[PDB]
Symmetry: D3
Subunit: 323 residues, 6 copies
């Protein structure tokens, strides 16, 4: 006995943890309608030249139309003179960040991969198009659209469908073997990795690192000092201080909880978790991990928080070499 008091759950409990955010009864119909809504919007793919140049790759700006009639951007890097269809890698970035430096993924192009890195709407990248909502609250981007009449105007639903469209576009490229596409990302990018592999089940491998956007109600109940999950509390303090609508708010967040999309995943998943992480508590991550629909494995860093995890990029690189 004599187990100390952790802010989160003991590891033995994590592997059986079922989550604590309600799954709406019409979850499957919600996402089929979302995928149908997306398919009814013509992608209108335009590929435009980039300023960054190197003999290692062809660098481009990839533009497409997402739900809400918004133009969305992704960095696109393709190998010079490909001869046979080859793998591709989709990368997703952290909350409020952007797709990052071109040169950080040139080694994947050197392996022969196409790499596409999405810029999330309104964050630090080139996606600057905003879909409207009926009820605008400045309190929270994560909860944008939560007060609309129907649940289809959630900002995170547009974001998830953006990842689905990017995967659809990349898979359809003639140079890309549709059976050899992977996804990876940190934090928000980890959650988007799983949402992408769920809405495009053709994805073969997925490597999220401490994924964000899981188990919203568990995150709220833990009363975390810092981090983006505090947007939930900020919204409540602004628009429902007595929590009269608590059940309706969390039932709608259940539509965009990655843990309830996880059963659709067919990719093999390699998930990295650090146990001192108070930004993405391990319990919220394993809520999604435990519901994954394909083969899966995890890597633990007991003494680390939401930071660089030494050796993980090599582990992911070796994992993605099997594509």
């Amino acid at each position: 006995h004599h187990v100390p008091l952790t802010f989160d759950l003991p590891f033995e409990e994590l592997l059986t943890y079922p989550g604590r955010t309600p799954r709406p009864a019409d979850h499957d119909e919600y996402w089929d309608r979302g995928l149908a809504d997306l398919a009814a919007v013509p992608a209108d793919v335009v590929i435009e030249p980039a300023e960054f140049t190197t003999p290692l790759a062809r660098c481009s700006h990839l533009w497409f139309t997402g739900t809400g009639g918004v133009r969305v951007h992704a960095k696109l890097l393709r190998p010079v003179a490909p001869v046979e269809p080859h793998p591709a890698l989709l990368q997703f970035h952290g909350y409020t960040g952007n797709s990052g430096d071109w040169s950080s993924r040139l080694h994947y192009v050197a392996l022969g991969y196409t790499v596409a890195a999405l810029d999330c709407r309104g964050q630090a990248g080139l996606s600057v198009g905003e879909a409207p909502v009926e009820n605008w609250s400045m309190a929270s981007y994560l909860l944008r659209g939560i007060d609309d009449d129907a649940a289809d105007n959630l900002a995170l639903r547009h974001l998830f469908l953006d990842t689905a469209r990017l995967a659809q576009i990349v898979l359809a490229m003639d140079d890309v073997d549709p059976d050899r596409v992977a996804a990876t990302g940190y934090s928000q990018g980890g959650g988007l990795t799983l949402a992408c592999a769920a809405l495009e089940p053709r994805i073969r491998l997925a490597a999220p690192v401490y994924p964000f956007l899981c188990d919203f109600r568990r995150a709220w109940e833990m009363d975390l000092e810092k981090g983006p999950y505090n947007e939930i509390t900020t919204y409540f303090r602004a628009r429902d201080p007595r929590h009269l609508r608590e059940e309706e708010i969390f039932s709608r967040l259940g539509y965009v909880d990655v843990q309830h999309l996880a059963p659709r995943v067919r990719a093999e998943v390699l998930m990295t978790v650090s146990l001192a992480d108070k930004i993405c508590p391990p319990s919220t991550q394993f809520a999604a991990y435990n519901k994954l629909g394909g083969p899966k494995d995890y890597r633990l860093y007991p003494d680390f928080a939401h930071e660089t995890l030494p050796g993980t990029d090599d582990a992911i690189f070796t994992f993605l070499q099997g594509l």
Copy 2:
């Protein structure tokens, strides 16, 4: 010998000129804004509120602002109005809302009409969002700063909302248009001055540590906490090398309250706390020193961005002269 301060010594506050650039066409921008507002029909709708009391008729006041959105304000009026009487406009703090109905019933008991605006997208009922060409989630204060022209700034729409509220209230048949005042704390203090500037008929104005003044001075001071950090948050997202620093701060000059201050004709009573690190006193005096009407200030040397004992009585006594 002068002692060290995080801000400026009080001696230099009274002559401080501000450090945020004034665009050469400031006047044309705001004249164009008021003309744009006047070209949108107000479409005023007044509906009863659930809160009831024998002290006041409480209503929801709805109108259309710039950008094609509906805006809400609380409206409190005497039950059986007789002669035309004074009115008071109130503006709330950043991310808050117009607050409790009962906190202003004593002004109605004096015979005043009270109107309290809900700022767009904040904690109240104004939930309509004007679109922008370039959306950044980094900052509401800088929303619209990357559009082609400076007419899509979110702060511009907000200022014109206060102008419309003043116009509607002054036009009410039971309101003497020469006996209208405005007051507010923090963001509400900055909106009080913007309102008294864009509707110069306002007779008295009582801002408390006003926000939204001297943006560039605020950015240069390195403030650990507070809403002025939204400027740094934006630069970190969309211009980390400050290649567009001059253009961003020039555009912000359009919505810097200090440059609207010369239009104010109301008598102003401004309350300032000297240990305030959310709205540093220097940013407040940048606007105060440019005021176009009579003015006086009240200081709280040992207080920060908090409740200031005696200020509500000072404002009430000040507003009794309406």
Copy 3:
């Protein structure tokens, strides 16, 4: 399975019995206190105040409490009442004062008398100090704890001050003794319940996150900040090995609001914020669960010891039933 929390899970709050022991002679202690108070002539003096408004007669109310000290309260009365009318007693926060005259004028406009006590030695006009045998600067709350008998506790005098103020207001010719209410925040919330217990004729009581409850529970939680840390400060100074732990907390039981709550006959509306680490919800419900009259509560799950939006309207609506 319930999630971790710094306090108790909400489902355990409504059955929580407290931890500070109830003294066996609690009744005799408080009957003796009321007898001690009655044996001191109140010596009521009412003088006009500087603050003036057509909405109310404003006055300074002075009386003598236990220990022979003079105590002050703000007094606001309707300008021309005919029949007996309601009254409202207000109590302020720890180390604060009765506050601004104008923040209570809407109650006078309803026809109420309003009386707002200034606590001894705090930020108001009550500056008289009752002596003690053993003085420790470590804690105001524990002042008098080391005297021979328990009748010199500084909190006892304070509670009897609220009782005397209620007695004076009920005895006023134009105050209906059946239509008196009490309300207050934090320290004022605990004083509201102490007042309604020692003057059970009070009809309504509206405390907000009440202080001065369940002293032992507060000490055992070891909070980072707040006035409950005065208990720890006293122990570190005058009993570092806790040789007198039981005598100290049994003494505090006399001035624990939770053990006066069974005397309350007023209907109580209690507001609680669940992230409050100044007054933990468990200590508040120790008193709530022992209340002797009708009762209801209002929760703010994500708020701490701060402004609670809607609470002033909720209290105003509650107090309109006077």
Copy 4:
């Protein structure tokens, strides 16, 4: 180039004159204080302590101070003195007490008598409180500041307690009155200087980062923590607009150790740590620079309000020359 410091650069410390006024009747105030003290019979009572050791006779010493209050000091005497010998007076830190008997037995082994005062109301055995006309719980340091005359200041009673202890110890038959020293840390350092000023016969004085100097300088500084913040607490409670700022700091000049420093004739060895934000070096040098006897200082550049390695040996070597 002088790098930026929170306090003053060291070159300016040696000429720093202080920033707290100095009353024109300072000398008359303190001559009256000593005469008031002499008019109260000491009524010295000495009883054995439970702590026992063959190295010393350990006793409790009780006397009456100004205000009709009983004051305690620890008294340690050599077992076989035989001949008149030196004595050492020790004063303790703010809110503490005189500390362990065994921490000063090496001075008794030298042949010295040791007396260690317990400050009124702090963690020791001095629990008697002198009354004031106007009680504010905000600050012990400013207790008495609002009375009619300035003779009820709590710090004045404390300073006169150190003088009485010195007078009692010097009059002992086995104490050579010209071989008496004083020493202490923080509050005890300020009391060391006040004692050597009010009993100028004291030969050596060893303060360590002394407290209770240059109150106005401390207030003007951005002190995040420490007992000097009691001044701000008082202003926030009883004078938030600083209308009485000049009166308050003029009265504090009576109990500022820096203005007692010219009376000191003892040789002083002062220890200062330069990163100290509790007692800023500038406030200490305000007193040091005005000292009336020979003096030297010891600097610890990288230390704050903490243990200073080597200082107790330095003081011991200094006090062996008694």
Copy 5:
């Protein structure tokens, strides 16, 4: 809320690392390695002077061939053999001021105060290791081939050597010697009384260097036990060697030396202490091999505990 264990469970708490199976053999080899190193004791005058004592620098050779320093204070004119007191200082500090122990010399005692290797005193000799990591002094040597190069072992053997030297002094009654210290000095007090069990009394205050695995598991924000986490983050981020690291640390855990202690122990502990959690201290207290009592300060942390110096002084007068 309950940061540590409730007091009700402290007196039965067994610690979080099992006694190594060859613990006795490890320390018999350590003491034998020490005995094979000549002490080469040198005593030199110190600058601090007082009529109350002779003050000296005491130098000797410890394991690893380094020179180790202790302050030595002796009565000026002793007649018969008399008691002695050994003192140990806090982590990264030094033996402190000469004058803080003159009252023990005035009782007639010899006082010896060790300076720990590499800390703030005069012991500046460093024993080499095969694998050097800058992350942690406490775990220095943990990655060498055998466990005999642990820096903490050298430190423990220094206290044993100092005690052996002091007991062997002609004017010291070897059966009237005590040890005391705060924090690291409290743990060294216990190690000293274990490796030289002739020590009669021991008075540790919130002892350090106990129950390492429990300390790491508690995720303390702050303080010297965080060196364990710092080492793991540097040299084993996935904890592949977790079991070998902690069971190597069991050799230098003071709790497993506690059964050798025969001195009467007076342990002072403060209950709000987050630097040395009470549970880790009672892991050692519960295994002590001699008479024992404790003193509690419920509202205090890792700070001065009023009355403790008088309690220890009264306790040590029975020497």
Copy 6:
């Protein structure tokens, strides 16, 4: 005006001369250092690594440095080179290691050899320690500072390790000795400059907020956090009164990167963040202003000691001109 800063205003950064003394025999010290290194046979051993990829040949590079210790570096070479090609030396942050193999494979795909040193005793495979006469656990940076001569400084061994690593890579058969670069962050930035100074054949250098510059300036500043506080930690342990301050800082001048900067002939691209309180900009420009070759800088005004978006692309483009 008055733009207060924790560091120096940017106008003065470009002229700042440093504050740490340069020893008069600086040139002789480092020529002796290079000669001592040359007298130790490098005994280079290259072993295959376990990380594998078709993009590169990955190996462990081992050599002997000063003090008779074995040092490790990660070595990545392009598979089957047909002509001499460029090489890149990378240095890591304080207490870190050379990092993941795959983070530099894109340079190998360009045709470069990459060598990444592991600093002695840090998180990598270099675990050999050179002995010192006087060991203090207070500071690795100041290790060896108390020895009789200055040739035992730990920083000197570290700097000579970079020289040997550069010498080994420059001497490789398939490496063009005229096309070698160095780059690194923080400690790796200082090592980048030390390397290009002790091996002046280095062609390009790209440090990011370099560490190990202007030790005295670093100590003189506030700086609550960061590795520069090891200086204060050492002083608090081994020189609390600063009696040896001039000796300590004179010795640090031998290993202060600013005084090796005049030897640099590489073109330097230095990246600086202006809110960096770990490596203050003034300390970095002390070295930059003394650089002996072509140079340019990149600024991030709102960033601290963190990831600087765009910097890896900027360095990559810079290194493509190799």
